[PDB]
Symmetry: C2
Subunit: 219 residues, 2 copies
């Protein structure tokens, strides 16, 4: 049995899956679909995933789509390279950080959404509201990296970094100068960006396209 | 070591934790906080949870807050009553359903949010948009229950039902007549509502308060 994963460029849910696969060094087959050409809605994809989304994934008769379910399945199916420590108490912290990352999406990426959605309708009395929420959110993670001095959950790479980093990258892709404002996250970013597995899974379309820059003002 | 959980009434994240605790029959200590009196922001809560949210949870030196992390920790710490089957392939389906339930929140509960948020500003040209999304979302789950004939993920109660049911209940609490429109979800609801563990964890404030009814029109 050899895993197969349909995924697109610039998608954190897909990145999570690719990182897990690479980090555990599992040989897999893939189909890099085009979002702009709506390939995530192909019939081939819909048979496996009624929601027409990526990642979509198989491994024999095993079919799983939620990026988080795929990662959990991979951790359980291919145990040789653990992305979780063995200590139950410490694993709890890894799980905490993993799932807590859904907050970045809401409190951070909302800042970008707003400027794009209701554009031309810029209300700085509200703009400064969500901007402060983004910073409040990032502060938590900043403190976390500060607290460990290394990776988002512990002093080693774990499933939590698989969830967190893609979000950090997307933030920087939007142009966040975190160098001085969030020295720990930035230190974490540059550190991670240097990890082989991450260099290998950078979103394909990023190199030859310009940053959306919806965050150039962040900090 | 005895678990301690701070939680509030009518909160799906808290319900998930209570169900897991009850279903595995773990004896725990609790603090039922008042949201209206802002007790989720107490100092006692903030020391353990910098976000000032519930559930907030401890078990010795073990501190975990994300409802999903707590459930995973409980599954791993107290294995006697498994909420997951042993088959790795089948567990994958349980994980799929568990995490996919985050969609109900977005595609379903948005319908309720909108009518509350931008109220008085009712735009039925858009109202009928999200209403159709709610039905599309529920259809997936309807088909799932149809596909199994029993619980949301398999023919037994699993961690997936722990995630799904609270959302179904909240929907009905908003007044959804799913009897004829979603016979399988409704059958699932009445079935679940009858399970001892669920009767015991119904949101405390529901009995003596009226349904918000933001869904009475759903179907
Ligand atoms: N909860 C899913 C979400 C996946 C998702 O949102 N995928 C996007 C790309 S990042 C997609 O394919 N979207 C297409 C759509 O909604 O049609 C996960 O984490 O896997
Ligand atoms: N992702 C968390 C979310 C918890 C959450 O949103 N809790 C709400 C009650 S349902 C809360 O305490 N909210 C207070 C707040 O944001 O201040 C989880 O699932 O545990």
């Amino acid at each position: 049995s050899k895993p197969f994963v349909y995924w697109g460029s610039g998608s954190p849910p897909c990145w999570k899956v690719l990182l897990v696969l690479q980090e555990k060094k599992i040989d897999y087959d893939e189909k890099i679909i085009s979002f702009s050409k709506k390939e995530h809605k192909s019939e081939e994809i819909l048979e496996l995933n009624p929601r027409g989304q990526v990642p979509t994934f198989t491994d024999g008769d095993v079919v799983v789509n939620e990026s988080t379910a795929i990662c959990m399945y991979l951790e359980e199916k291919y145990p040789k390279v653990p992305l979780f420590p063995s200590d139950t108490t410490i694993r709890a912290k890894v799980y905490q950080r993993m799932f807590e990352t859904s907050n970045i999406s809401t409190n951070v990426m909302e800042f970008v959404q707003y400027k794009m959605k209701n554009k031309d309708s810029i209300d700085q009395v509200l703009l400064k509201e969500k901007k402060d929420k983004a910073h409040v959110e990032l502060g938590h993670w900043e403190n976390y990296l500060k607290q460990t001095g290394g990776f988002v959950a512990t002093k080693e790479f774990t499933m939590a970094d698989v969830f967190f980093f893609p979000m950090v990258a997307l933030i920087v892709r939007q142009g966040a100068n975190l160098k001085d404002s969030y020295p720990n996250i930035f230190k974490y970013y540059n550190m991670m960006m240097d990890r082989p597995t991450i260099v290998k899974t950078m979103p394909p379309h990023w190199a030859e396209s310009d940053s959306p820059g919806n965050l150039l003002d962040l900090c």
